[PDB]
Design an enzyme around this catalytic site. Structure first.
Site, mmCIF file in Angstrom:
data_model
loop_
_atom_site.group_PDB
_atom_site.id
_atom_site.type_symbol
_atom_site.label_atom_id
_atom_site.label_comp_id
_atom_site.label_asym_id
_atom_site.label_seq_id
_atom_site.Cartn_x
_atom_site.Cartn_y
_atom_site.Cartn_z
ATOM 1 N N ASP A 19 3.071 -22.097 -14.867
ATOM 2 C CA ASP A 19 3.971 -22.821 -13.978
ATOM 3 C C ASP A 19 4.567 -21.949 -12.875
ATOM 4 O OD1 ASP A 19 3.468 -24.917 -15.702
ATOM 5 O OD2 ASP A 19 5.336 -24.653 -16.826
ATOM 6 N N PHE A 75 3.698 -24.865 -11.272
ATOM 7 C CA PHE A 75 2.367 -24.716 -10.691
ATOM 8 C C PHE A 75 1.248 -25.080 -11.660
ATOM 9 C CE2 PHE A 75 2.974 -21.743 -6.803
ATOM 10 C CZ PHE A 75 3.622 -22.784 -6.165
ATOM 11 N N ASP A 114 -2.417 1.075 4.922
ATOM 12 C CA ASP A 114 -1.955 -0.215 5.421
ATOM 13 C C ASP A 114 -2.793 -0.649 6.624
ATOM 14 O OD1 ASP A 114 -0.392 -2.490 5.413
ATOM 15 O OD2 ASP A 114 1.189 -1.612 6.656
ATOM 16 N N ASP A 162 -2.456 -30.669 -15.137
ATOM 17 C CA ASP A 162 -3.251 -29.876 -16.068
ATOM 18 C C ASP A 162 -3.262 -30.482 -17.469
ATOM 19 O OD1 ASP A 162 -0.686 -29.338 -16.950
ATOM 20 O OD2 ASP A 162 -0.983 -27.174 -17.123
ATOM 21 N N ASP A 193 -5.601 -3.048 6.295
ATOM 22 C CA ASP A 193 -5.257 -4.463 6.196
ATOM 23 C C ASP A 193 -5.103 -5.122 7.566
ATOM 24 O OD1 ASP A 193 -4.719 -5.146 3.200
ATOM 25 O OD2 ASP A 193 -3.673 -3.239 3.497
ATOM 26 N N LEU A 249 -0.227 -27.705 -9.952
ATOM 27 C CA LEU A 249 -1.034 -27.303 -8.803
ATOM 28 C C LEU A 249 -2.390 -26.762 -9.243
ATOM 29 C CD1 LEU A 249 -1.588 -26.389 -5.828
ATOM 30 C CD2 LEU A 249 -0.324 -24.305 -6.380
ATOM 31 N N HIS A 265 2.529 -32.719 -15.215
ATOM 32 C CA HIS A 265 1.594 -31.790 -14.588
ATOM 33 C C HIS A 265 0.177 -32.349 -14.664
ATOM 34 C CE1 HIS A 265 4.510 -28.216 -15.615
ATOM 35 N NE2 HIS A 265 5.086 -29.171 -14.916
ATOM 36 N N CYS A 278 -1.436 -23.958 -20.282
ATOM 37 C CA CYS A 278 -0.098 -23.943 -19.739
ATOM 38 C C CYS A 278 0.645 -22.680 -20.158
ATOM 39 C CB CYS A 278 0.666 -25.182 -20.183
ATOM 40 S SG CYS A 278 2.238 -25.298 -19.370
ATOM 41 N N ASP A 318 0.892 -1.158 0.000
ATOM 42 C CA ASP A 318 0.000 0.000 0.000
ATOM 43 C C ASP A 318 0.922 1.198 0.000
ATOM 44 O OD1 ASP A 318 -1.503 -2.286 1.533
ATOM 45 O OD2 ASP A 318 -3.089 -0.920 0.867
ATOM 46 N N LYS A 323 -11.464 -7.372 5.098
ATOM 47 C CA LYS A 323 -10.704 -6.824 3.990
ATOM 48 C C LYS A 323 -10.245 -8.046 3.231
ATOM 49 C CE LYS A 323 -7.408 -3.574 2.158
ATOM 50 N NZ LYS A 323 -6.845 -2.193 2.182
HETATM 51 CA CA LIG Z 1 -2.489 -24.777 -12.023
HETATM 52 CA CA LIG Z 2 -1.128 -3.711 3.488
HETATM 53 CA CA LIG Z 3 -4.242 -3.006 1.110
#
Ligand SMILES: [Ca+2]
Ligand SMILES: [Ca+2]
Ligand SMILES: [Ca+2]
Ligand SMILES: [Ca+2]
Length: 669
Positions: free
Chosen positions: A358, A415, A182, A480, A185, A418, A478, A651, A163, A370
């Site tokens: 990835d 990833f 901030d 995916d 948050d 993932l 992967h 991908c 922020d 928030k």
């Molecule tokens: Ca993924």
């Molecule tokens: Ca913040």
């Molecule tokens: Ca913020």
């Protein structure tokens, strides 16, 4: 005869018939007084009356039965105790009174009297407890957390974002406030200290965090007022205690709290903060009272493909003697029909690293409110290393990552491996936020997701609760590749798309059953050798490959059906052929299952299959399988800039989606 125990301090107020004694007491907390301290002249029993707003009780030496003293004479031998309670906060020092008079029979009346003055105090550390609004008042002492729609203790956001444009790092790392924004948050904590100032000049309030949680939380307070410069950090990693500065008229102090660390293997998410009250005129020093609140780190949550698209990410890369600009235009076209933002990462940032799926996983974090999204930056570290940390991390967007020992990462750390399922209720146990899916080597061997760190981090969130699939048979490995999800009006609803070699061979044979038999593969265009429908079928090398592949996908099918509570109506089989290189499975034609899902619009890699009467038959098989659900199938060429490199559309893209309307704190993991 247990060896040793940490045991609570006992303050017992002594009495004197010669001199009146004074005592401090916190509202709603018993005050142990000793009636046996000074007993006059062989007195048989006693009578004690006090006022006003004072309560006096007797407690037998078991844990139970407060018995309130009436006006009746109490025997001086009981199971020993007396307890006094002050209902309000005292307006002045020693303004509550309690008098004890001792009797005998052995009359006329009291053989002596002991006097006790009481100073009432209100000390309560308060947080946000019913989830709304602001901090609420619980005494009413309840548990620090409870998991249902029921109600529980407080929530705290791990604060990671800038922020602040002063610094390169999230506000998490800084020991001083930067932006005022901030504070939005952070979780509110009210300290109620109510009573005489002359009291606070002797007995002091002190605010603590355990050493265990010292590095997991920062606590800020403004001594000054309400200006950016006036905020100091009262609690932090190397500051375990704060000696409260309390100016006489100020009886309620606001504190701001921010989470340093997400839940992990070392951390289950519970953080405790304390306000104690001590009397410095003492060595050993005594702590008269303690109130402890608690927080829960808001977990990192993933969005499945079934969620509405917001921003799609694709990087402009060029070279191998060419360019992907065409693909980028297809992607612009495709994104702006779905009404979603299209972010193109230019070539200077990505270093021609085309796989943006990835490198990172999009997610979000949420409080009473928030709520802002967070990026999980993979250990992958190749061409995109700096993109999440530089380009993405910003005012409302978060950053989180886990580093890795040697010699990581592996390919399973990418990833694309993932993912997460749509909301699913299984066997009476419901998973409203879905279930995380990560690929691994078959159980009982081989390379896992090469981060035990990110695995730990993912199961630690204790929300969607990852299940492990088998991706290792694939060269890239992967999930995916053989797996995805699409949204649907019915039933649950959504449908899981699985790669199905057997279905593809099935289609080809049933079209060989028609004239149709020798229409070929890679027909649409080519510099690359054409091939048929019948020496697919006649060749058995490729069908060892595809029967093996279909077998593996069948295993993953049994796991997915078991864990996600799925029935065959939920599953849809998209025809896909594979082939074997060095015992590992690559894709024979571009992989349709790997695809970008934006609402009912599906960006799909375009396979070039048998051309029969104006159309690619694979494409239309897919259309017949999907379109009845309301999904318009768009086919995009990824071939040279992606498929050649053994990756496809999903991908080559990364999609950030709208967070779940359901609130994570309302489920029961
Ligand atoms: Ca993924
Ligand atoms: Ca913040
Ligand atoms: Ca913020
Ligand atoms: Ca990285």
């Amino acid at each position: 005869h247990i060896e040793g125990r940490h045991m609570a301090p006992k303050r017992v107020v002594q009495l004197s018939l010669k001199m009146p004694t004074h005592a401090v007491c916190v509202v709603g907390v018993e005050a142990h007084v000793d009636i046996h301290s000074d007993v006059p002249k062989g007195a048989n029993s006693f009578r004690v009356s006090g006022s006003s707003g004072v309560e006096v009780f007797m407690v037998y030496n078991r844990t139970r039965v407060k018995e309130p003293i009436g006006k009746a004479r109490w025997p001086l031998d009981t199971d020993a105790d007396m307890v006094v309670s002050v209902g309000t906060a005292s307006k002045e020092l020693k303004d509550f009174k309690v008098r004890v008079s001792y009797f005998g029979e052995q009359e006329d009346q009291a053989l002596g009297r002991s006097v006790l003055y009481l100073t009432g105090v209100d000390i309560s550390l308060e947080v946000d407890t019913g989830r709304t609004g602001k901090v609420k008042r619980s005494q009413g002492d309840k548990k620090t957390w409870r998991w249902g729609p029921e109600g529980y203790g407080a929530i705290l956001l791990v604060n990671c974002d800038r922020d602040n444009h002063r610094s390169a790092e999230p506000d998490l790392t800084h020991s001083w406030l930067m932006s005022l924004a901030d504070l939005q948050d952070m979780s509110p904590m009210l300290l109620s200290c109510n009573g005489p100032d002359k009291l606070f000049d002797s007995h002091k309030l002190v605010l603590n965090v355990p050493f265990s949680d010292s590095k997991r939380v920062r606590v800020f307070c403004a001594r000054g007022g309400n200006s950016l410069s006036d905020y100091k950090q009262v609690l932090g990693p190397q500051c375990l205690s704060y000696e409260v500065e309390r100016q006489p008229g100020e009886q309620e102090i606001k504190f701001y709290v921010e989470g340093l660390t997400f839940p992990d293997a070392d951390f289950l998410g519970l953080v405790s903060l304390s306000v104690s009250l001590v009397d410095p005129g003492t060595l050993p020093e005594v702590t008269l009272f303690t109130d402890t609140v608690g927080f829960r780190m808001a977990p990192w949550i993933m969005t499945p493909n079934t969620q509405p698209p917001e921003e799609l990410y694709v990087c402009r890369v060029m070279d191998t003697h060419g360019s992907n600009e065409k693909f980028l235009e297809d992607m612009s076209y495709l994104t702006l029909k779905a009404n979603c933002k299209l972010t193109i990462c230019p070539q200077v940032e990505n270093r021609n690293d085309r796989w943006i799926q990835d490198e990172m996983e999009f997610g979000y974090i949420e409080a009473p409110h928030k709520s802002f999204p967070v990026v999980f930056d993979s250990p992958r570290n190749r061409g995109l290393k700096d993109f999440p940390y530089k380009r993405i991390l910003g005012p409302d967007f978060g950053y989180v990552t886990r580093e890795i020992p040697l010699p990581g990462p592996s390919s399973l750390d990418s990833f694309g491996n993932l993912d997460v399922s749509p909301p699913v209720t299984v066997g009476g146990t419901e998973y409203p936020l879905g279930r995380i899916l990560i690929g691994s080597s078959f159980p009982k061997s081989g390379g896992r997701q090469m981060a035990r760190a990110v695995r730990n981090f993912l199961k630690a969130q204790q929300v969607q609760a990852p299940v492990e699939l088998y991706s290792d048979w694939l060269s890239v490995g992967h999930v995916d590749e053989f797996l995805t999800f699409v949204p649907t009006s019915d039933q649950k609803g959504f449908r899981l798309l699985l790669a199905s070699p057997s279905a593809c061979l099935k289609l080809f044979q049933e079209k060989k059953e028609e004239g149709y038999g020798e229409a070929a593969q890679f027909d649409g265009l080519k510099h690359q050798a054409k091939r048929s429908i019948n020496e697919m079928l006649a060749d058995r090398h490729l069908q060892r490959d595809n029967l093996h592949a279909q077998k593996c996908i069948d295993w993953n099918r049994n796991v997915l059906k078991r864990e996600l509570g799925l029935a065959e109506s939920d599953i849809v089989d998209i025809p896909q052929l594979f082939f074997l290189k060095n015992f590992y499975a690559e894709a024979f034609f571009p992989d349709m299952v790997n695809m970008v899902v934006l609402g009912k619009y599906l960006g799909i890699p375009k396979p070039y299959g048998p051309i029969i009467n104006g159309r690619c038959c694979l494409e239309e098989k897919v259309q017949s399988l999907l379109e009845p659900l309301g999904l318009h199938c768009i086919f995009i060429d990824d071939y040279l800039s992606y498929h050649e490199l053994q990756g496809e559309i999903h991908c080559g893209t990364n999609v950030r989606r709208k967070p779940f309307p359901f609130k994570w704190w309302n489920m029961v993991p």
